[PDB]
Ligand binder design. Structure first.
Ligand code: RU4
Length: 119
Protein backbone atom coordinates (compact mmCIF):
# COMPACT_ATOMS: atom_id res chain seq x y z
CA UNK A 1 0.00 0.00 0.00
CA UNK A 2 1.20 3.55 -0.73
CA UNK A 3 1.75 6.28 1.89
CA UNK A 4 -1.68 7.89 1.55
CA UNK A 5 -3.47 4.55 2.28
CA UNK A 6 -1.43 3.87 5.36
CA UNK A 7 -0.98 7.40 6.88
CA UNK A 8 -3.73 9.82 5.72
CA UNK A 9 -6.53 9.99 8.35
CA UNK A 10 -9.97 9.22 7.05
CA UNK A 11 -12.02 12.43 6.60
CA UNK A 12 -15.82 12.80 6.51
CA UNK A 13 -15.69 12.82 2.67
CA UNK A 14 -13.58 9.63 2.77
CA UNK A 15 -16.34 8.06 4.98
CA UNK A 16 -19.03 8.82 2.38
CA UNK A 17 -16.90 6.85 -0.15
CA UNK A 18 -16.40 3.90 2.24
CA UNK A 19 -20.20 3.71 2.72
CA UNK A 20 -20.69 3.56 -1.06
CA UNK A 21 -18.02 0.80 -1.45
CA UNK A 22 -19.61 -1.28 1.31
CA UNK A 23 -23.15 -0.93 -0.15
CA UNK A 24 -21.82 -2.05 -3.58
CA UNK A 25 -20.45 -5.25 -2.04
CA UNK A 26 -23.65 -5.90 -0.02
CA UNK A 27 -25.68 -5.66 -3.34
CA UNK A 28 -23.44 -8.08 -5.33
CA UNK A 29 -25.06 -11.42 -6.34
CA UNK A 30 -22.16 -13.48 -4.85
CA UNK A 31 -22.15 -11.66 -1.46
CA UNK A 32 -24.82 -13.88 0.18
CA UNK A 33 -22.36 -16.03 2.26
CA UNK A 34 -20.75 -12.88 3.78
CA UNK A 35 -23.68 -10.57 4.64
CA UNK A 36 -24.04 -11.76 8.28
CA UNK A 37 -21.92 -13.73 10.80
CA UNK A 38 -21.51 -17.48 10.08
CA UNK A 39 -24.33 -19.46 11.80
CA UNK A 40 -22.73 -22.09 14.07
CA UNK A 41 -25.82 -24.39 13.67
CA UNK A 42 -24.79 -24.63 9.95
CA UNK A 43 -21.04 -25.07 10.64
CA UNK A 44 -20.49 -26.46 14.22
CA UNK A 45 -16.64 -26.33 14.05
CA UNK A 46 -16.32 -22.87 12.40
CA UNK A 47 -15.60 -20.83 15.60
CA UNK A 48 -13.02 -23.37 16.82
CA UNK A 49 -10.84 -23.00 13.69
CA UNK A 50 -11.37 -19.32 12.66
CA UNK A 51 -9.89 -17.16 15.39
CA UNK A 52 -10.96 -13.67 14.05
CA UNK A 53 -14.35 -13.97 12.22
CA UNK A 54 -15.58 -11.06 10.09
CA UNK A 55 -18.71 -10.25 7.98
CA UNK A 56 -20.17 -7.31 6.08
CA UNK A 57 -22.80 -6.40 8.78
CA UNK A 58 -20.00 -6.12 11.39
CA UNK A 59 -18.13 -3.82 8.95
CA UNK A 60 -21.30 -1.69 8.43
CA UNK A 61 -21.63 -1.23 12.24
CA UNK A 62 -17.94 -0.22 12.40
CA UNK A 63 -18.32 2.29 9.50
CA UNK A 64 -21.42 3.89 11.16
CA UNK A 65 -19.51 4.25 14.46
CA UNK A 66 -16.39 5.72 12.73
CA UNK A 67 -14.23 2.80 14.01
CA UNK A 68 -11.66 3.08 11.20
CA UNK A 69 -8.93 5.81 11.40
CA UNK A 70 -6.94 4.80 8.28
CA UNK A 71 -7.86 3.12 4.96
CA UNK A 72 -5.45 0.26 5.71
CA UNK A 73 -7.62 -0.78 8.71
CA UNK A 74 -10.80 -0.97 6.52
CA UNK A 75 -8.93 -3.00 3.88
CA UNK A 76 -7.63 -5.38 6.58
CA UNK A 77 -11.19 -6.19 7.87
CA UNK A 78 -12.43 -6.78 4.30
CA UNK A 79 -9.45 -9.03 3.46
CA UNK A 80 -10.16 -11.09 6.62
CA UNK A 81 -13.61 -11.98 5.21
CA UNK A 82 -12.04 -13.52 2.09
CA UNK A 83 -8.99 -15.11 3.75
CA UNK A 84 -11.15 -16.76 6.47
CA UNK A 85 -13.36 -18.25 3.74
CA UNK A 86 -10.45 -19.64 1.67
CA UNK A 87 -8.89 -21.25 4.80
CA UNK A 88 -12.10 -22.84 6.11
CA UNK A 89 -13.53 -24.17 2.81
CA UNK A 90 -11.94 -26.38 0.10
CA UNK A 91 -10.94 -24.82 -3.24
CA UNK A 92 -13.81 -26.56 -5.13
CA UNK A 93 -16.65 -25.37 -2.84
CA UNK A 94 -19.13 -22.65 -3.97
CA UNK A 95 -18.18 -20.60 -0.85
CA UNK A 96 -14.54 -20.45 -2.02
CA UNK A 97 -15.69 -19.43 -5.52
CA UNK A 98 -17.78 -16.56 -4.06
CA UNK A 99 -14.70 -15.27 -2.21
CA UNK A 100 -12.67 -15.24 -5.48
CA UNK A 101 -15.37 -13.24 -7.32
CA UNK A 102 -16.18 -10.79 -4.58
CA UNK A 103 -12.51 -10.04 -3.75
CA UNK A 104 -11.86 -9.15 -7.45
CA UNK A 105 -14.91 -6.81 -7.33
CA UNK A 106 -13.66 -5.22 -4.07
CA UNK A 107 -10.23 -4.50 -5.65
CA UNK A 108 -11.97 -2.75 -8.62
CA UNK A 109 -14.03 -0.55 -6.29
CA UNK A 110 -11.08 0.14 -3.93
CA UNK A 111 -8.95 1.39 -6.87
CA UNK A 112 -11.85 3.75 -7.82
CA UNK A 113 -12.04 5.06 -4.21
CA UNK A 114 -8.26 5.65 -3.99
CA UNK A 115 -8.29 7.60 -7.30
CA UNK A 116 -11.14 9.84 -6.08
CA UNK A 117 -9.29 10.75 -2.84
CA UNK A 118 -6.29 12.31 -4.64
CA UNK A 119 -8.08 14.07 -7.55
C1 RU4 B 1 -19.54 -27.39 5.59
C2 RU4 B 1 -20.79 -27.13 6.37
N1 RU4 B 1 -21.91 -26.79 5.49
C3 RU4 B 1 -22.29 -25.53 5.25
O1 RU4 B 1 -22.85 -25.14 4.25
O2 RU4 B 1 -22.02 -24.71 6.32
C4 RU4 B 1 -21.35 -23.51 6.05
C5 RU4 B 1 -21.98 -22.30 6.31
C6 RU4 B 1 -21.32 -21.11 6.04
C7 RU4 B 1 -20.03 -21.11 5.51
C8 RU4 B 1 -19.34 -19.85 5.22
C9 RU4 B 1 -19.90 -18.68 4.83
S1 RU4 B 1 -18.68 -17.50 4.62
N2 RU4 B 1 -17.50 -18.72 4.73
N3 RU4 B 1 -17.94 -19.76 5.32
C10 RU4 B 1 -19.42 -22.34 5.25
C11 RU4 B 1 -20.07 -23.53 5.52
Amino acid sequence: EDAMTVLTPLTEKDYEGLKRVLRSLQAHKMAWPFLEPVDPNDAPDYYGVIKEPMDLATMEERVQRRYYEKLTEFVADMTKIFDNCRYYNPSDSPFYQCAEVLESFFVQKLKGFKASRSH
